[PDB]
Amino acid sequence: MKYILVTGGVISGIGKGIIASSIGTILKSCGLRVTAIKIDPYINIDAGTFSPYEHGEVFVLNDGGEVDLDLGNYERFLDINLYKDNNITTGKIYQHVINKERRGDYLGKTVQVVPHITDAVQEWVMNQAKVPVDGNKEEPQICVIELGGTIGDIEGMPFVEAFRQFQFKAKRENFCNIHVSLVPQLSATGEQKTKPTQNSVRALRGLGLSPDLIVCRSSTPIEMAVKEKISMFCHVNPEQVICIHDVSSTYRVPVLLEEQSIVKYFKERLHLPIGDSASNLLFKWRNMADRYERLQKICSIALVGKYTKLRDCYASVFKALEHSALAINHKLNLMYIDSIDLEKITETEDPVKFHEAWQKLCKADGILVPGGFGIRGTLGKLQAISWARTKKIPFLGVCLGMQLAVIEFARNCLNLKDADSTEFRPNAPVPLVIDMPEHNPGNLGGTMRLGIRRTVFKTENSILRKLYGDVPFIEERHRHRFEVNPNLIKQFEQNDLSFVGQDVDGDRMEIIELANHPYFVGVQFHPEFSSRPMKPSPPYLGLLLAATGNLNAYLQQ
Amino acid sequence: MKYILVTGGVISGIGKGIIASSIGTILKSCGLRVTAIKIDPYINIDAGTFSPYEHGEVFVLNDGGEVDLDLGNYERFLDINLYKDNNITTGKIYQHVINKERRGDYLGKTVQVVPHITDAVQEWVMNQAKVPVDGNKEEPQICVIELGGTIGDIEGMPFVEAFRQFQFKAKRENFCNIHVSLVPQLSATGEQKTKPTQNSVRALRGLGLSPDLIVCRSSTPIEMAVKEKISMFCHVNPEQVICIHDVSSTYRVPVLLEEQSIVKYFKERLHLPIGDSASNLLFKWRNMADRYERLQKICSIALVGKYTKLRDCYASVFKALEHSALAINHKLNLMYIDSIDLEKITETEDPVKFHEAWQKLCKADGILVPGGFGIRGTLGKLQAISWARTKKIPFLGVCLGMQLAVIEFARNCLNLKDADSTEFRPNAPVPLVIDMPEHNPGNLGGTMRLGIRRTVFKTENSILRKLYGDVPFIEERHRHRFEVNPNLIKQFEQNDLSFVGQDVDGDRMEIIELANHPYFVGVQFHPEFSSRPMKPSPPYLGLLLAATGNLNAYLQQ
Amino acid sequence: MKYILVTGGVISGIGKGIIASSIGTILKSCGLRVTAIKIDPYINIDAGTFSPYEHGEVFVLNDGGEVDLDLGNYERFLDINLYKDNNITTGKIYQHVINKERRGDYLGKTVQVVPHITDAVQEWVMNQAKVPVDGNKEEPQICVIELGGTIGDIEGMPFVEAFRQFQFKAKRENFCNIHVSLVPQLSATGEQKTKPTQNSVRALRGLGLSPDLIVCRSSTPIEMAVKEKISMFCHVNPEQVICIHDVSSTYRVPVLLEEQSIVKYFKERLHLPIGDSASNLLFKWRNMADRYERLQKICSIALVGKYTKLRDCYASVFKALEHSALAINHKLNLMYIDSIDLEKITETEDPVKFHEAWQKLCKADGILVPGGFGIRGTLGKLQAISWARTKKIPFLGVCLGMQLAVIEFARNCLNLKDADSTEFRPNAPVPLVIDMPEHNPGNLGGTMRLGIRRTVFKTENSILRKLYGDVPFIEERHRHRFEVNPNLIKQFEQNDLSFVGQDVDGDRMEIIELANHPYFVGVQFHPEFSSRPMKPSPPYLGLLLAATGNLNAYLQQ
């Protein structure tokens, strides 16, 4: 199997992840079955512990893995569905070697970082690179491996030593190394400095790997004097020194790498089945990036979120809105609202932030209430959902935003105002949203509804069924314990909020639609994880169609 | 003696030289006698070989050393006059140890980089730190040493090993280490990255030195989260992590370091005689930097130069004009003209550049023709000198610009039009400028007029004598072989170009003034090397006084 | 051209020089024209400054270079005659780049360690590798380069960086890298430790070279568990991990390397013209090493030397006696006498050392008085020469030992007892040995008789003429200012000391033989520099023939 290791030299933030994704998109576009692995040298075994303000969003895989948001980037840029073990961590690798030691699988030998942790990294890479990750059943051809942190980090030492050994298990004509490095320039001279690239490549050779491409991250395109000096210290030819300068879009990074001629180099170096050709599918990526720079018409939506600021807490929710806005030829404007700042309570302590949040909500062409857990921000979310319903604004509720949209319709439209959740107010007089965990043979106690599940349409009279292509059912990704109470469903059948999607066991109601409204829907699944740049996730496409006013024209095709 | 070594971590362009100068200015302002050394790890033994487009200007010392332009920065920021051996080079140190080996001073032992090159660096530092460099006869108190290149460079290895040994010859309470490092930030996240500082400080500890301050070069002020993380890896307290972010002026860098509290730290660390005090002379520097940001009135001068572009070819010529413009409360505008682009010949091949050069010359409030050597640009210089004379524009000619201003007055005002130089057209029919080298006992052949020489005024009727404070003579720095022909001086005495300055031997005429003009003067010395920020060099002060029109009012005080 | 760089990893004393010599002997034995270069990273430009107690002997080349004794090892192990520039030094390379800077050959650019010192090392290697060094006129095929010091030394940094660049100027199929490393073992466990090899190979990869063989220096042969672990960290195959454990003879090291199969590897790696073959000339080396272990009969000689102990002061004098003793099938016993300990004066201060020196001299089968300079030890040398003459012992006097053997025959056999030298007692009443330097056009003043000179036989009645193959003249290497006085030659013609060799100018007498003695000869040249393991230098062969008593039987063949 062919392997591309992507490493970082100078500083951790240089974009190793967009390079590795774009390399993957390129090789996918050449007609190769591409898999991808990420090494996160952190001790967390999975993402499920993360508070989304720190580190970012938790991404959910088809298999029910809770994984880093960076593996969602590989799922967007390559048409693939990763398994949880395409994320390798220091926590996973050390936990696996510890468990083998406790069982005595190491035959009473001393278990050591070299060879035994380093052998575990190589066994795990060869095993997961062989797992099919496209729709096709046949095994992959290239694995793109991204290694987190920078060369010379303590946390990365067991993985660079694993790849030092691995480039001899996989032959020369199979293993390949991309080093991503910072080429800084200062504002006074305006000279691009090769020195951190030199010192990080010296360190990478000491650690025992040698670059096959160098990719320079720089604030403007590198000159030939930089390409030749990097070539003089780093043992690469000047055509094997690339730059990815900072640009308009991540959709442009694959297109810059094809201009910098990386396909020719991988055909030579990895002996790839590509052939010489005048075309590959990157013309569809080139169109999408040239569309993205031409987006002039604004479409502006309010995201009523559980957190004080966006770093990455809604990173794929944002990307699903962008795919949908690109597909609808509008520039997305994401008006983020820290949900607590809508609460009537806060005007007694910070009225400037309270009026600011409501002005931003009143601008909206559509409202998105995304998923989450806990009491925090729920009251502010409820005020925005009820604004969306009363002021006739297009609406998508995801997971928690759907549970709150069942709750507020019972409170405000059935006058069942003692109705509440069970995660918040667990003693509720009429518990309309309830704890209802998944339970199976071979598992201890109740567990989350987590990963891909079939959700079946109840009726042909659904806007989501139309947006999903008039199909009988959908498979979509879930991450929750809680559900609408199945016994309290009767109180809805007289009135405007319908349920339109249901679990295959019948036990759970999973999609709602409010009648007599432009578009108002809630889903229990997270449709953003299934979203792709070339083809938006239908609930977000419907929300942005409805936001500009195109939905009633889209349903005619 | 107290010693401050200043080193660079990540990349060479971070401003080690303005840090080391400003540390020096600070300690000078506290009342200490400060000397300064620079290590240039290049193999050039002196600057005299440099073509000024590459590397920059050649600076001339009082002793006749041809030295790097960076030692001119230490002469400007500290009121000192360096000797040639305050510049240490790899060429100097290796040449000195080779010469001792040839003589057998090393007693037939193998001469080795360690100890013998490293002992030569320490002998040279202790010897030159003891040389008085102020007007005062008493020995210095602090030496500021700047080391060129970055940590981990091959060229810097013999000097970091010398300072590793040296910090035990000079005790702990005498030796101190400033590490200047890049803290980059990327445009997307806007996060200041400590990682290159970490890796360069690890390398500096391996090489055997440990920082006592860290100075961060960054595009904006470093946050406390950066100060604390650098402190966590680098073994400095968070108050010992400074930044010098990019700013309006080099005159502000000393003032930023006093705000960042370095004086308190050097009093503690080096046990300095400063005492605790509410004041030190940096209030005069603080005034000058707050003046420099308030310069609104433009004063615009044409510099008719021998080179295709300014990197640093006229670096102290520019600084002498800036000191003069600050002292006259005007913003200098330096209209640089590549002199060849004034030649009537070039319009036959690039007329766009020809008209562009003459438009820039026609804007001028004053003209400066600086020194140089060779045929190149002389014809274009002559056209600008004759423009300056005919169109009544204020004028300073330095070295070559003075020789050309004697030549063109013979050509165009005495009608001696066969008159020419000897460096250019060495066969001249009437050689008005001639080769006339200095000759002495204990020297082989003729040699340059090089370093400080007494030039004596011929008359009280001189504008330069008035600008020099009505003094009988001046001492100023020279760098030339050539002179006006002493036998052809008779042809001038009837007409408007006077000679007003002469050598003490009488053999050489060294200052000219043209009558019936606002200000038109030429000097054989380079007055810019003697110029200081607090007190401009009189010929440049006169040129910028005359440029705005203030000279006739300045002569009244 | 093919190039073999030999480098040292862990400690400097591991035998890089015997590895590089033996690689050279191997490739010479395969039929290749082999040249050799040594890098000495010391600042001495030549060996002429060395006091032979420190560093060792000064070796003299055919061209008159005074060079390191290590280049004499390459002259012994390969049948070659090196030029002075096959020794590269830090002194030579820095002196050459400094001289080019002073002349302006670098076009007014800043001259830097990278590229300009590193380019000087590569220019010098390509230039000297092309110089023919065998008797054949055709250019070499392989250059063996030995680099002194160890990886990570400051002194070696400009040369490892030169070879890092050089392995891309010379292609992969031309440049090759041997890393010699210590594999220690401790007395308690008896385990061979690969760790210093690992860490020095990591450092060598950082510096930018990667091993192609590893040669382990170890106290016993390395096991396969060591070969496989070194292969696992160092990126060599286990057949490319050699050892040279400590052994009986340097003549065995080539023979151990052919057992460890290096010829096969160089044919593969350097595409060498060798062909596959069942034989190469190393069977003659294998014979000589199996002879050397069978030497049982002692032949014991007194060397009356100018120094307090042998480190290497007589290193090639010793090797010329060993070649001669091997050729005569005797084990040499070298009774070294610190010459001062024979002086009658020393019995007044250390009589134990005085009687010890005379007991060792009285054991002698032959006496060797080697060359030198100065007053020191001359009186003790004279007492041993006069012992050799009076007690009928075989005798060789080299350079100073020849001058003293003319002096003592005038003093004790002509009764000219006021006769003395001019280097010692320069005021002599009858100066029998005189300062007589070589003088030529294109040189300033008088200079040493230095390098190869033709010495012509005066008579057929010479034992040295017989030992030299009855040839009319010899070419041999000289290193002195002093000579026998040509005017005082008349005093000898009546008596037993003949002169038998003379310069081609006639001006100098260069060989003496004493009649009525088994063998007593002196030469002005140093015959040991011309000596080779397969064919001894005739004056030393004659001395060891005469010592056992074989000379009168050798003259019969």
Ligand SMILES: Nc1ccn([C@@H]2O[C@H](COP(=O)(O)OP(=O)(O)OP(=O)(O)O)[C@@H](O)[C@H]2O)c(=O)n1
């Ligand atoms: N395949 C990818 C990769 C990155 N991004 C975007 O780029 C950002 C992260 O950039 P990345 O390439 O991961 O580099 P950094 O995270 O900045 O740093 P690192 O080198 O550690 O990845 C994310 O906000 C994400 O929106 C993306 O959309 N698709």
Ligand SMILES: Nc1ccn([C@@H]2O[C@H](COP(=O)(O)OP(=O)(O)OP(=O)(O)O)[C@@H](O)[C@H]2O)c(=O)n1
């Ligand atoms: N291993 C190396 C590489 C270069 N240098 C030195 O680096 C200096 C140039 O400094 P700088 O411009 O900082 O290095 P560059 O190689 O030009 O890299 P950059 O592109 O970052 O400037 C030269 O004098 C050269 O002797 C060194 O000492 N050791």
Ligand SMILES: Nc1ccn([C@@H]2O[C@H](COP(=O)(O)OP(=O)(O)OP(=O)(O)O)[C@@H](O)[C@H]2O)c(=O)n1
């Ligand atoms: N005492 C000083 C130091 C610097 N400068 C200005 O700053 C520039 C050079 O900055 P410096 O501090 O020398 O840093 P760099 O030269 O950029 O890089 P290095 O760290 O190698 O010095 C020069 O153009 C000079 O005009 C100055 O005016 N006075």
Ligand SMILES: Nc1ccn([C@@H]2O[C@H](COP(=O)(O)OP(=O)(O)OP(=O)(O)O)[C@@H](O)[C@H]2O)c(=O)n1
């Ligand atoms: N010697 C060190 C120091 C830090 N880390 C790792 O560095 C990672 C953080 O990466 P990055 O942000 O790139 O490093 P910072 O220390 O935050 O430095 P910067 O300010 O440049 O981000 C952590 O996971 C930590 O395990 C490491 O492996 N080895």
Ligand SMILES: Nc1ccn([C@@H]2O[C@H](COP(=O)(O)OP(=O)(O)OP(=O)(O)O)[C@@H](O)[C@H]2O)c(=O)n1
């Ligand atoms: N071609 C050679 C090489 C070495 N020797 C012998 O080996 C000793 C020196 O060993 P060498 O191989 O030069 O290694 P060292 O000098 O011990 O250390 P280095 O690795 O620095 O050479 C000398 O005394 C010399 O007699 C020899 O006879 N012939």
Ligand SMILES: Nc1ccn([C@@H]2O[C@H](COP(=O)(O)OP(=O)(O)OP(=O)(O)O)[C@@H](O)[C@H]2O)c(=O)n1
């Ligand atoms: N880059 C490396 C290589 C090895 N080890 C560790 O080295 C230990 C073995 O120690 P030691 O025997 O000293 O190393 P060896 O590799 O066996 O080398 P040697 O032949 O010198 O023993 C193992 O636990 C392994 O984790 C390490 O931490 N880092």
Ligand SMILES: [Mg+2]
């Ligand atoms: Mg990432």
Ligand SMILES: [Mg+2]
């Ligand atoms: Mg540079």
Ligand SMILES: [Mg+2]
């Ligand atoms: Mg500088």
Ligand SMILES: [Mg+2]
């Ligand atoms: Mg960080």
Ligand SMILES: [Mg+2]
């Ligand atoms: Mg040696």
Ligand SMILES: [Mg+2]
């Ligand atoms: Mg071990």
